[model samples]
Target: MKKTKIVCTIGPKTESEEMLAKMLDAGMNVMRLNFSHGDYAEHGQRIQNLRNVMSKTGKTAAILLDTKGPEIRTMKLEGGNDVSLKAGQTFTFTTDKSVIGNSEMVAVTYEGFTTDLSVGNTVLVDDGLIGMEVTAIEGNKVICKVLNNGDLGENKGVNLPGVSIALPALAEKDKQDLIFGCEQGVDFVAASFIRKRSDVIEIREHLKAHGGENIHIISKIENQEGLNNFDEILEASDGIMVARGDLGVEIPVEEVIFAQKMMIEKCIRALKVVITATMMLDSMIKNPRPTRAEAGDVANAILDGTDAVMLSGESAKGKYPLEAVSIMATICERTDRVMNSRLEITEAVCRGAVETAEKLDAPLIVVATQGGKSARAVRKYFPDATILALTTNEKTAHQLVLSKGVVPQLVKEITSTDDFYRLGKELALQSGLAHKGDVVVMVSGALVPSGTTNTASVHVL
Candidate 1:
């Protein structure tokens, strides 16, 4: 089994039932819904489709709802025609929607466009495709001189590389989406453009208010502000997503690898999940195979100890979604074979359990978990022992699908140590993991609260 989990986005390319089934077969452990593009009806239907596929196949997969955070974008262009800008030419961005952007003037949807920007600030449009330097600020209008000539289209993204535009964490659209995600019972909610610890707390408060407190919150670190407050943000959320696209744009591109390493190590030590995403297989979106560089990127992330690696457009709107996943799985398997021998355990309890399993040549590792942390911790060693993760929470079981070698089985809540060993032995036999007189190892914290795992024992089946 592939130890590194794979996350694929759902969109025009892989939203259908057939394509979704194929993606699952190709080792897609988590399905992501990009809330930035579609309406509620469309997204709701896609979620339904995902559940249908899961039910049809009896295969577990977690759904992640990703929100579009506070950001600026261009308004509609004239006749929706793409505008061509020339170098050293002056253009205007006004708050008034009445102005149609052409070769000279454009309309910005953000109301505080001029108030947030000042003269000499650099503005990038369409993911830095077009560069402009702010020249002057007039009444409700910000004038700019194009530094690079490029074609700008309607609804293109706007980015101020270094400027800290004071925008709230949750925009109006994201608020509505969060409520809808709660109603839909998504396994996780990914909040983008997270800048501070307060941003994560604000989302948690909203989730709690809506009776969706169990839904996992993933804080997306995308800027210098987020990096500066990284430790606080990681402590406050269920997981972290290294959104390298905007992070690279916000800081120097050369520093992204170091940032990724830091986030992955922190999450592992903190026992929180971390996903390394963005541009892993970008070239595979159009090609049947991935580039050598993209393959190396995926391998390095796995070697860095990320909980999961994600696909954006490569799975959402690509020509070869299955191929992308297959290649990723292959690379992960190859890398693990080479690196699993040197695996080191950070947590003492987990280290002891894994070391004992390896020494005894235990056939199975049965873990009684509530939040699936024990299972995740065991996955790091890629032990030869098959990991049977017994959880009462169905959501946790589904989320465990991304962890390598973990087979999440929904079992009754364990009450005592006897119940834990009995249930572990029963499932080990029934699931064909072990037989009578065979020995297996169990890990649990059933004597205490549900989220903590501190006990490891060897059981004779």
Candidate 2:
């Protein structure tokens, strides 16, 4: 049986070297740094602190940087107050231009938003809690009718549905943030609010330009657009994240569950890592123990074949963040014992790896798999070579430990597509399969977003 992987998002309330150490000790494989809430320096400090803890504890946990995309969010109101925005009322949101906002006419925090949006357009704030139907559009002054009743205060998220909001997935701030993350040798970059597969291409271009082609890319699936374009997005991105929070806003809650299942199946079929994100421990936000339903949610995802499960506010700021992660880990371990009957694979990727490795007379072959299928396929050949199961999924990796001649190494959640090469090479070097000058054969399903199989590559070294 495999232990499901757990990723804990770090934030002010639960982000410190000490807390990070505890998270690792509690079974956190990936440390996610969300850039939406903090400045560069603060994020840098958190990363550094996490690294320091890892150095001290000797843990090889992966670090992921969540890029702050071009989505617009309201400013934080003074005193942290929430204002009621009723349906049919008008509001203004400026790009840090206006000092204040009211129900009749509030300012958008983004400078160019008013110009970018138009009449008859759609706007969603606070994860779509408050909706607005654009009535009139002027230069930086969009008049909108509130479509729902909700409290919308400063720094609430704003979404433009159906219209190209003109927000870049990799903004200037993201560029700067990526530079710092790369300088620190971060493991992966989780691109957020990706509306199209092209968004990932732009990020890939940015990585190449910044000499960071090695870092991984994990596309955060937070919108209907991402879901509809899941296959293409999976092909383009390195990994996929089923971000339930935002998806819940764009679609029905029941649909998010189905999406989670489908995305995991798709990613595994593609042999790319897939993460089940958001609301893992909703009860833990204010309680010590997670709800029975929440626990079941974690277990069910493992059964559905998710490589990883993400922690948002539950781990970022919850009072029982560490405990929440621990509970999830336990659930994953327990559920894994029953996962042996489940098997899925990409025959193309698996066959290619085995063939290449055999031809090369390799004694050991490593399939950097998120799901168990790769190892299972290689095992079927009963090859003379040892099959190493290297994975970012703790459950998938742990479950592989039971396989004959298979050594499983639990790694951090891979954030980028190239990360397979990085981990694959490390396995080769560590297992004495290849020397510094030798080329090691590598095989993986697609690591692209919503990618359900269809990737087969034979790379040397």
Candidate 3:
């Protein structure tokens, strides 16, 4: 099995039972719900379908709610229609709620848009497709000259490349959605456009107010501010998602490559899970097969040591959701065989477990972990052997979904090494991880210490 995990976005095309089943079978480790698009009932149904499929298949895939943070956008055009703008033409953006958008004027959602811009600053609409430069600013209005010809649609997203506008970290909409996620008992919730550690700290406040102690918080880095505070955000976050969609727009597109490498390396050094997301298999939306470039992107993300690679539009609204997930799994499997993580051998027992498995030709490593620390430690070495990690904690089991090379299982108990040998051997046989006469390595603490993984032994199943 591939060590690198796959995260798929569930959407209108893929919220069905058969689709969820096929995705799980294709090695999807996490199911992400993009709160940007759907409402409560729609998302609730998808979760029900996912749980049903998981219950029947006996597979574990964590649920992730991707919150739509404080994003700035342009309001609807006049009469809810699109308008065109020509190069060097005058355009107007107003904060007045009564105004509608046209070729000459548009309504901006951000009230401070006029104050946030200056002469010659760029204003991008609809994924930076329609470019404009601010020429003048009036009270409650900003004037700009169109730099290109493009159709401006209703309610299009707006981007201010270098502008620093003050906004709440969690918008009211996101808080309600996050509360719903907490009520749903999701395994993870991703905060969008996270700029600093305080942004993550705000999310923690919501989780604690609700019943979400077990839910892991994933910070989505999407702006220049976020990249500047990456280390502090990483320390505050349980995981991170390199959301290259907005991130690429916030910075020069070409620089996103280096940012991915830098962020993934830093997160791995901190032992925090990281997901490389957006447009991974974008072309597969309509095409049956992924473009070679898209395939290379997925492969390279694996090689970059991303704990998981996300499928956004491809898996959500794509026509070939099943094929996209299946193809991405194959790509991860191919690349993970060569992916490397470097460090001095400070985790002596876990390192010893991996080394002994390699030297002794053991094909499996059984781990008894309390919070999945030992399994993650062993997985850091990138062993060729598969790890069947047994944990009694359900939250620990779900959280390990993103851990590479670790197949986490929830056992009822692990009171002693005797219990490790007995359950390890029994479950290994039942789960088809090992058979009779097969040598496997086991690691845990001698006195059953929670975080101390000192004891390493070999067993023949």
Model 1, TM vs. native? 0.91
Candidate 1's C-alpha runs over 4 A off are 341-346, 379-386, 432-439
Best by lDDT: 3
- Kindly list the per-residue Cα lDDT of model 2 for residues 355-431, writing each as its tens digit: 66667766566666766566656554444456666777654553453343355677776555577767777777876
Candidate 1 clashing pairs, residues 3+ apart or interchain: none
The order by descending TM-score is 3, 1, 2
TM-score of 3: 0.93
Higher-lDDT candidate of 1 and 2: 1
Q: What is the C-alpha lDDT of each candidate?
A: 0.85, 0.72, 0.86
Q: What is the Å distance of residue 395 in model 3 from its true position? A: 2.0
For 1-461, candidate 1 gives per-residue lDDT tens digits of 56678899999778998988998888888999998799989888898998999899888898999998888888877888998999999988888977778878888878888888999988888888888999999998999999988888887788877776667879998999999999999999999998899999999999899988999899999888889899999999988999888887778899989999999988876767889998799898999899998898888998898878999889999999889888888887787666552255225666778788878778788998888888877765657677999989898898787666678999767768888888888999998877887778898874566567788899788
Model 2 error, position 321 (Å): 2.2
lDDT of 3 at 206: 89
Residue 195 accuracy (lDDT) in model 3: 88
Model 2 regions lying over 4 Å from their true place: 12-19, 38-58, 75-83, 90-96, 111-121, 138-140, 252-254, 341-387, 390-461
For candidate 2, the 10 contiguous residues with the lowest summed lDDT are 448-457
Q: In what order do the candidates fall by lDDT, top score first?
A: 3, 1, 2
Instruction: Give residue 308's lDDT in candidate 1 (0 to 100).
Output: 88
